[PDB]
């Protein structure tokens, strides 16, 4: 499923991401835009053989099991395929654990390089929330 920008903002808000760990909703929408282009089915393979899954491109090296990242962990206790659902609950619940691990949203490279220090509120402007 490819979310609209306001559609995704409303779903993230319902799932508790607005101001979660001090990150306003615009940060989460901005990160999803540049990580996956709002596409829940996005996958990308990393150099170390791990793979990023879903609308927030969560890495199998640490966070989910795809059966093909040797020595990896599964800290969100989910199959990586669950991160590709049209239902974003699994992605949100896992992202909540990631952003709480000490490094905030710096875990997402696209957020650090393209969202951090910008007017992220522009990503939710005009949306009914
Ligand atoms: Cl915002
Ligand atoms: Cl980047
Ligand atoms: Na894993």
From Swiss-Prot:
Q: Name one GO biological process term.
A: killing of cells of another organism
Annotated binding of substrate, by residue: 101
Catalytic residues of the enzyme: 35, 52
- What Gene3D superfamilies does the database record attribute to this sequence? 1.10.530.10
Q: Which UniProt keywords apply?
A: Allergen, Antimicrobial, Bacteriolytic enzyme, Disulfide bond, Glycosidase, Hydrolase, Secreted, Signal
Query: What does the UniProt entry say about where the protein is found?
Result: Secreted
GO cellular component terms attached to this protein's record:
cytoplasm; endoplasmic reticulum; extracellular space
Q: What is its EC number?
A: 3.2.1.17
Disulphide bridges: 6-127, 30-115, 64-80, 76-94
Q: What SMART domains does UniProt report for this protein, alphabetically?
A: LYZ1 (SM00263)
Task: Tell me, in a sentence or two, what this protein's role is.
Answer: Lysozymes have primarily a bacteriolytic function; those in tissues and body fluids are associated with the monocyte-macrophage system and enhance the activity of immunoagents. Has bacteriolytic activity against M.luteus.
Q: What else is known?
A: Lysozyme C is capable of both hydrolysis and transglycosylation; it also shows a slight esterase activity. It acts rapidly on both peptide-substituted and unsubstituted peptidoglycan, and slowly on chitin oligosaccharides.
Q: Family, per the entry? A: Belongs to the glycosyl hydrolase 22 family.
The protein, known as: Lysozyme C
Q: Which organism is it from?
A: Gallus gallus
